[PDB]
Amino acid sequence: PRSPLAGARVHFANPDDAIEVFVDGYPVKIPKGMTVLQACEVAGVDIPRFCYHSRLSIAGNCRMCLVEVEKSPKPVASCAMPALPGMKIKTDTPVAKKAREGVMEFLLMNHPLDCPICDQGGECDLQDQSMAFGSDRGRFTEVKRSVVDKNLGPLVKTVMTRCIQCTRCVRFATEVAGVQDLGMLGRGSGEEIGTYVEKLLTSELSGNVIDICPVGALTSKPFAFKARNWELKGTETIDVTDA
Amino acid sequence: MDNQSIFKYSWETLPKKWVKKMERSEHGNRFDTKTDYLFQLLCFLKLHTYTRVQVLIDICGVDYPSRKRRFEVVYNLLSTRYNSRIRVQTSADEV
Amino acid sequence: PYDVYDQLDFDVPVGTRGDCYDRYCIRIEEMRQSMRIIWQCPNKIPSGMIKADDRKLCPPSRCRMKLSMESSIHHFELY
Amino acid sequence: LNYHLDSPDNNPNLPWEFTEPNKAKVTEILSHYPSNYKQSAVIPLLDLAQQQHGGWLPVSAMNAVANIIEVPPIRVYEVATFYSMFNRAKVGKYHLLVCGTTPCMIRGSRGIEEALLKHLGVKRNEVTPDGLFSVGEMECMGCCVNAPMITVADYSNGSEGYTYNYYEDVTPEKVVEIVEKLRKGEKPPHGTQNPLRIRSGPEGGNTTLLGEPKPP
Amino acid sequence: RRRVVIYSPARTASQQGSGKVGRWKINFLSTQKWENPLMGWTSTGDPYAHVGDSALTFDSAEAAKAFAEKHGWEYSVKKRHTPLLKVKSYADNFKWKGFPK
Amino acid sequence: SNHTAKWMQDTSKKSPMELINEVPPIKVEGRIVACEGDTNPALGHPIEFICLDLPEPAVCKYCGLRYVQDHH
Amino acid sequence: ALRRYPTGEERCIACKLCEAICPAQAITIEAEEREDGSRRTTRYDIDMTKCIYCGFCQEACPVDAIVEGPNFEFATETHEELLYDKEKLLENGDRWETEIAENLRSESLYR
Amino acid sequence: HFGGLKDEDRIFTNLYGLHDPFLKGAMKRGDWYRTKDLVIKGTDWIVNEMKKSGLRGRGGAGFPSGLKWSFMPKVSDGRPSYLVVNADESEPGTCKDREIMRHDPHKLLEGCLIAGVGMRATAAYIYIRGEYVNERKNLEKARQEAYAAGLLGKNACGSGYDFDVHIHFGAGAYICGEETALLESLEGKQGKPRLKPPFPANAGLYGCPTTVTNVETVAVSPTILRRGPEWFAGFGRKNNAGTKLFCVSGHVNKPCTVEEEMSIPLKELIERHCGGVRGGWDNLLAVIPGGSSVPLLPKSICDDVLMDYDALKAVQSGLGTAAVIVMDKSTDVVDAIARLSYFYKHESCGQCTPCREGTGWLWTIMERMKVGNAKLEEIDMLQELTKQIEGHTICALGDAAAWPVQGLIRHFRPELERRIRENAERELLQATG
Amino acid sequence: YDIKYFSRDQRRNRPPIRRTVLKKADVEKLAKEQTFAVSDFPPVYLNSAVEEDINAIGGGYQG
Ligand SMILES: Cc1cc2nc3c(=O)[nH]c(=O)nc-3n(C[C@H](O)[C@H](O)[C@H](O)COP(=O)(O)O)c2cc1C
Ligand code: SF4
Numbered sequence A: 001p002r003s004p005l006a007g008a009r010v011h012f013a014n015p016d017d018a019i020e021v022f023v024d025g026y027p028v029k030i031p032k033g034m035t036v037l038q039a040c041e042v043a044g045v046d047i048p049r050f051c052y053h054s055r056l057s058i059a060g061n062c063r064m065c066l067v068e069v070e071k072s073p074k075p076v077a078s079c080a081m082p083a084l085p086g087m088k089i090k091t092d093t094p095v096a097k098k099a100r101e102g103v104m105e106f107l108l109m110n111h112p113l114d115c116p117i118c119d120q121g122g123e124c125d126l127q128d129q130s131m132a133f134g135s136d137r138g139r140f141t142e143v144k145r146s147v148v149d150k151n152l153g154p155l156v157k158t159v160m161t162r163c164i165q166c167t168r169c170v171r172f173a174t175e176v177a178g179v180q181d182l183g184m185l186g187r188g189s190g191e192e193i194g195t196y197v198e199k200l201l202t203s204e205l206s207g208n209v210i211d212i213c214p215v216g217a218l219t220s221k222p223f224a225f226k227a228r229n230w231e232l233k234g235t236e237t238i239d240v241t242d243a
Numbered sequence B: 001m002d003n004q005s006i007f008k009y010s011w012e013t014l015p016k017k018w019v020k021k022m023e024r025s026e027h028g029n030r031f032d033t034k035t036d037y038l039f040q041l042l043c044f045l046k047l048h049t050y051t052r053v054q055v056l057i058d059i060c061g062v063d064y065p066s067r068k069r070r071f072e073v074v075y076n077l078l079s080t081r082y083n084s085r086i087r088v089q090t091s092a093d094e095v
Numbered sequence C: 001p002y003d004v005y006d007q008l009d010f011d012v013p014v015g016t017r018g019d020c021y022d023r024y025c026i027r028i029e030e031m032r033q034s035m036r037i038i039w040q041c042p043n044k045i046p047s048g049m050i051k052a053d054d055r056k057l058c059p060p061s062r063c064r065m066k067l068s069m070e071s072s073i074h075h076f077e078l079y
Numbered sequence D: 001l002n003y004h005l006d007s008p009d010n011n012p013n014l015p016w017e018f019t020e021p022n023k024a025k026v027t028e029i030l031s032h033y034p035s036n037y038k039q040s041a042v043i044p045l046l047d048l049a050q051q052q053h054g055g056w057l058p059v060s061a062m063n064a065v066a067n068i069i070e071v072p073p074i075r076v077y078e079v080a081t082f083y084s085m086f087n088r089a090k091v092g093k094y095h096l097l098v099c100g101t102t103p104c105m106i107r108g109s110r111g112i113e114e115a116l117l118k119h120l121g122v123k124r125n126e127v128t129p130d131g132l133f134s135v136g137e138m139e140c141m142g143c144c145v146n147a148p149m150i151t152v153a154d155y156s157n158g159s160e161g162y163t164y165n166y167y168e169d170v171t172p173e174k175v176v177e178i179v180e181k182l183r184k185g186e187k188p189p190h191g192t193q194n195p196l197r198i199r200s201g202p203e204g205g206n207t208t209l210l211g212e213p214k215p216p
Numbered sequence E: 001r002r003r004v005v006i007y008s009p010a011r012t013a014s015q016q017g018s019g020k021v022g023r024w025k026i027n028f029l030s031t032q033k034w035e036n037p038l039m040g041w042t043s044t045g046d047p048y049a050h051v052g053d054s055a056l057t058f059d060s061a062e063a064a065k066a067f068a069e070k071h072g073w074e075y076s077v078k079k080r081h082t083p084l085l086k087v088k089s090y091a092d093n094f095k096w097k098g099f100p101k
Numbered sequence F: 001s002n003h004t005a006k007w008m009q010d011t012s013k014k015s016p017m018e019l020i021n022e023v024p025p026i027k028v029e030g031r032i033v034a035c036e037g038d039t040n041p042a043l044g045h046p047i048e049f050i051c052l053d054l055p056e057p058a059v060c061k062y063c064g065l066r067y068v069q070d071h072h
Numbered sequence G: 001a002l003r004r005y006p007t008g009e010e011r012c013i014a015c016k017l018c019e020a021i022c023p024a025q026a027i028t029i030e031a032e033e034r035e036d037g038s039r040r041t042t043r044y045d046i047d048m049t050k051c052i053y054c055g056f057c058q059e060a061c062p063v064d065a066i067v068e069g070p071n072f073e074f075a076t077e078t079h080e081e082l083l084y085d086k087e088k089l090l091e092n093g094d095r096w097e098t099e100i101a102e103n104l105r106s107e108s109l110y111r
Numbered sequence H: 001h002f003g004g005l006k007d008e009d010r011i012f013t014n015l016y017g018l019h020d021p022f023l024k025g026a027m028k029r030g031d032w033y034r035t036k037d038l039v040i041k042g043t044d045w046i047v048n049e050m051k052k053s054g055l056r057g058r059g060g061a062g063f064p065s066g067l068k069w070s071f072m073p074k075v076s077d078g079r080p081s082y083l084v085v086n087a088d089e090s091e092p093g094t095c096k097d098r099e100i101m102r103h104d105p106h107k108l109l110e111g112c113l114i115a116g117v118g119m120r121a122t123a124a125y126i127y128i129r130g131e132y133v134n135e136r137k138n139l140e141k142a143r144q145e146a147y148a149a150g151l152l153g154k155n156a157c158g159s160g161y162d163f164d165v166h167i168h169f170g171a172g173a174y175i176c177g178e179e180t181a182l183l184e185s186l187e188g189k190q191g192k193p194r195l196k197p198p199f200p201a202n203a204g205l206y207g208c209p210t211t212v213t214n215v216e217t218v219a220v221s222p223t224i225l226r227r228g229p230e231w232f233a234g235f236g237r238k239n240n241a242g243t244k245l246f247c248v249s250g251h252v253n254k255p256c257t258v259e260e261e262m263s264i265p266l267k268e269l270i271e272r273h274c275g276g277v278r279g280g281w282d283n284l285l286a287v288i289p290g291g292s293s294v295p296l297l298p299k300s301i302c303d304d305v306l307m308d309y310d311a312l313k314a315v316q317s318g319l320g321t322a323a324v325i326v327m328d329k330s331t332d333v334v335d336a337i338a339r340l341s342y343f344y345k346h347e348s349c350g351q352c353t354p355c356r357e358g359t360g361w362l363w364t365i366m367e368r369m370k371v372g373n374a375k376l377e378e379i380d381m382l383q384e385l386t387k388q389i390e391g392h393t394i395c396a397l398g399d400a401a402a403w404p405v406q407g408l409i410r411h412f413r414p415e416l417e418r419r420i421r422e423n424a425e426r427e428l429l430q431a432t433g
Numbered sequence I: 001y002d003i004k005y006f007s008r009d010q011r012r013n014r015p016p017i018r019r020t021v022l023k024k025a026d027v028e029k030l031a032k033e034q035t036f037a038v039s040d041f042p043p044v045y046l047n048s049a050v051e052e053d054i055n056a057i058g059g060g061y062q063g
């Protein structure tokens, strides 16, 4: 008796057989090749993520969804980990807690410090994930790294100072959008995301890019600084422009 | 860590006919009872020569607009002689 | 005794025949006991920190908020 | 260095291609992979472009190779900017790279670096004008059991004559001699500068495999 | 009397959390605002301008429906979309194209 | 022209934008700077490390000071 | 008062933090991207009455934009005044910019 | 058993290349003898033989190569199979594979063929390093001569086994040394690693089953498979056996690279084959047994430690690539460690955040500690950061960036504390004026 | 210098709420096994007046 997150109608392509895994104790049923992250979801516990979107491909890139699966070595990336019958998942063990604390420590270490001007402040994943799962004190004094901002037409302006190298935008632009312009170039700490020939992005779904990109770097230009999120009310309607 | 004595004695000697829920937390000890015996229960207290409360501190209402029994009446009352306080919390609907 | 009050012994006067005069004398004796406490504090006040050790229930001070990074996140979320 | 082209005076998007022998070599290079996956050939092809433009690698060349392997140019940009052996800053006719890492530092490389830099007016990834001599620094290039080394890349005749050779067992006087011999003369015999030792081992009598091999 | 709409607010399109989904909530579709001529603040005259989504948060569509029916004002329940759960695979990410045609 | 027209009314003394354009660039020496003024607290403007690899000045996003790299 | 940098450049950056923490909701603030690029406030007003004087303003501000100067003699004869205008009169708080400054220095240590 | 390896048991009889070219048209003495029989003796026999020998993978992991080859799909399939040789040695201090490739290439080629058969592999790619233009020229000449002689191709030697081998230029980076990042950079994309749950035995190079083996093991494979696995197991120790070539360089009189048997006392190796240290156990301060990715070994420890996969692995370190470095008493050990950490900063490509950020941070802290501009709680913070990075990265370059500083603040705390104290005293003395 | 937020934040590290139901069987069992004693019923919190002076404490000074 444990409803999945948000309600999530699992498929059961072959409903005659389906594995079962122990998530934090009590068991849950799972289709053949479902990932550990979706198994935890079905069990009803959310796992912090940055570089995993249910509509794009997987990439163990942000390294924040770590859990410990007993019957295994120390760390495990939840996503991209295909569930096995009987593995002993565990999410709230000191190992996982410290893993999350350290990773958030590194992100917020080499992040910029401009929340009170950076819109998506009040909506930011990185912000909420840090406040809920990360530590409370930073230990860092030396100079950070900063890059120059970029223009991508009059729809998606970017202050790339805060491009935390998730490749969500890259994977979207190469899988769902269709046009391959965005790309991650550079090395090490000096790694930017930007078209190399200062071109624009002549495709639709770029608003979908600005929704995908969690931290507030790619943001809608015509909604530059007009409001935070906590200020305005949302009504759920349909569209009439398209068909 | 405050008044386990009075609460334990009161529960172990009460007529167990009219107690619907007991919670011995550390925030406050709760005797959730039925609205039909409330006067009976309170008159048991204030008179029994061990758990005599003798002072009623508060009668507050709480509103839960999602349950069939919409309201929640709560009586916070202490025992100045036995240095203890208990919270008798009853349910109550519209009329 | 919710707070430090133990280490702060005092008197707690009590009236013998409840009426206006005895409540009045109680009030004056309570003034004097409060003076006893107000002196006992500045003789024991243990110079140290204040208000917290977690910048998740208490906001960080100005220097940290404007120098460190996670201090700004916590100040923002907390306000 | 940088991660965004700035389109200088005469290098925005001028037309750029290969020669004819370079076309033949391009076919030969492209003939080593499954035709479905030709993206791999991006690593050798890129290099060829260098040897055709003097270690330059202009943006039109990246576009040309991206067109020759049928890929959106951003992937070729990624490849050409992630690695380290590709330069995009028109180094001089001769590039001089000095190694730095602990097993090669503690043999006295910093001296070679400082002396080579002082003999010219350059500043460590800078171009001595009359635009011969570019100098720069690199991480461990292997062979760090031999000596403090100095590698020289020669872009003189283009695809032919381009030569990327080491120079081991060096001392600042030998280095200044070598660089001026490169200017005036043409080619100094590379190697290890009078190896009283045997390459990649001891000095004099090698203490292994003394007389003759033998099939087991 | 007033027509009300009982829905469950969908997940925000900016974050990736889940602590705010599956929470039945009634809104009074009240929109009668105007611009205060002196300063420019947004005036109103509806007593139910904000209560429906400021304090009235219900546990389930059944409870919210019974409550609206009790106070009498007529309602019209909406639907709740839930994410379908497919199966993913890093191998499917690194699939293999066929032989040359 | 439009923002200062929306908020300011006097249009006799110069608007904030006009003053912050009247201040010239800084012409710093290295490649990265940090803008606060001259104190760490009591002057706000948290650390805002900003790159300087473009032939045009770089604004600071608080109290735009337009730092510029000096040499090549 | 709304201070500004020594360069004459305004301090406020429209975080909405003061408006969010206002326990009396006595602040209204509405911003827009300026022409030069930086973000500033198009309208900022505090209807002083509804603004009980609690202090949270000068604590929520990450750039010390808004502050409470030590002036208590403003006893106008018409409500509209105490509805301090759209940042304009608030900007004129800079007529105390010296005095206020002093206070801030003496509170940089323990605050 | 002990150290000291006779001349006849040695394998790489070319490591110096004077009377012995690459093409082996003059020196076919060693290789290509009867590979026809060794491939028509079936693949399962080859895997059994390797498992019986004990060839712990000489790349930096130590996996039992028998299992690693047995992991490939036994029953046939559709999509073909690929072997890939990881000739991308660029860990600072290793100069063995360079000599193997430059002087004795046909060893690597025949080993590639025999391992491709032993893995039911269809093709095989050797990923050379970038700045090896002359070595690459020699290797490519050798491969062309092997194709010309008909010894590597459709009918490999006399077997019906089809096999194509291909060289690939290197890039210039170092993360390409890793398994999955090697497969990636061979595809054509940037040199970044993959996630392990799709192990490169069912989803590898092109998605085909493809395994990556270091040039060491695949180059030693022919002679170990020919001379019988007992002659191989008769070396080293019980669980660690074989002949490995060390590349000793740093602060010795004679910097060298020579092949010995495992479990050889460092004293014996250094004092016997290489030149004795400038002062034999007198001014020798530190020793790094493995590559630059292995915690230190102070003087007191390394006097009597064996050199294998377990002895120093039990002490604290790991043999890794077996590139022993020595450092005298007149070389700032903290400066050497800082330089290594700077290298690791300059090589971590930066897919996932822990390695990238933490490595920049480690370099900064190590510089500040080199000058002496820190406190003691800062060295404890260094240990903490080390632990976090080591735990939670994608693959072993995080451990690489974490291990040396860990070993440093493990075996060298007193001198570091002394540096800090002296800087503090000098700062106070200067501030008093 | 050793930030570690769970061990510091023993908050949210509280045990779960434990519930139990009782029926007539358990009620009867507890009623039978239970037995009072002459002592430890509850304790009593007794306190009385003393009629103390004013100038006593610390010569009537310290506090
Ligand atoms: C940071 C890093 C550096 C590596 N460097 C090398 C290298 O120089 N040579 C190599 O063959 N493999 C290298 N690898 C890959 C591993 O050593 C891998 O286990 C090996 O290629 C296969 O092991 P085996 O062939 O010994 O069984 C590296 C891996 C990492 C994570
Ligand atoms: S996206 Fe902006 S608001 Fe969010 S933490 Fe990152 S910098 Fe702050």
Ligand code: SF4
Pocket: A162, A163, A164, A165, A166, A167, A168, A169, A170, A193, A213, A214, A215, A216, A217, A218
């Ligand atoms: S700024 Fe956006 S695209 Fe860049 S790493 Fe961050 S979330 Fe990804």
Ligand code: SF4
Pocket: A116, G011, G012, G013, G014, G015, G016, G017, G018, G019, G060, G061, G062, G063, G064, G065, G066
């Ligand atoms: S907190 Fe400060 S700058 Fe930010 S919006 Fe308010 S007064 Fe304006």
Ligand code: SF4
Pocket: G018, G021, G022, G023, G024, G025, G026, G027, G046, G050, G051, G052, G053, G054, G055, G056, G057, G058
């Ligand atoms: S002083 Fe307080 S009441 Fe006035 S607006 Fe500022 S935060 Fe609110």
Ligand code: SF4
Pocket: H175, H178, H192, H193, H348, H349, H350, H351, H352, H353, H355, H356, H393, H394, H395, H396, H397, H398
């Ligand atoms: S250091 Fe680690 S996470 Fe980073 S590129 Fe290397 S294997 Fe990937």
Ligand code: FES
Pocket: A048, A049, A050, A051, A052, A059, A060, A061, A062, A063, A064, A065, A077, A078, A079, A080
């Ligand atoms: S979500 Fe699993 S690693 Fe980023």
Ligand code: FES
Pocket: D099, D100, D101, D102, D103, D104, D105, D139, D140, D141, D142, D143, D144, D145, D149, H092, H093
């Ligand atoms: S350190 Fe210079 S060659 Fe390896």
Ligand SMILES: [Zn+2]
Pocket: F035, F036, F045, F060, F061, F062, F063, F064, F065
């Ligand atoms: Zn500024």
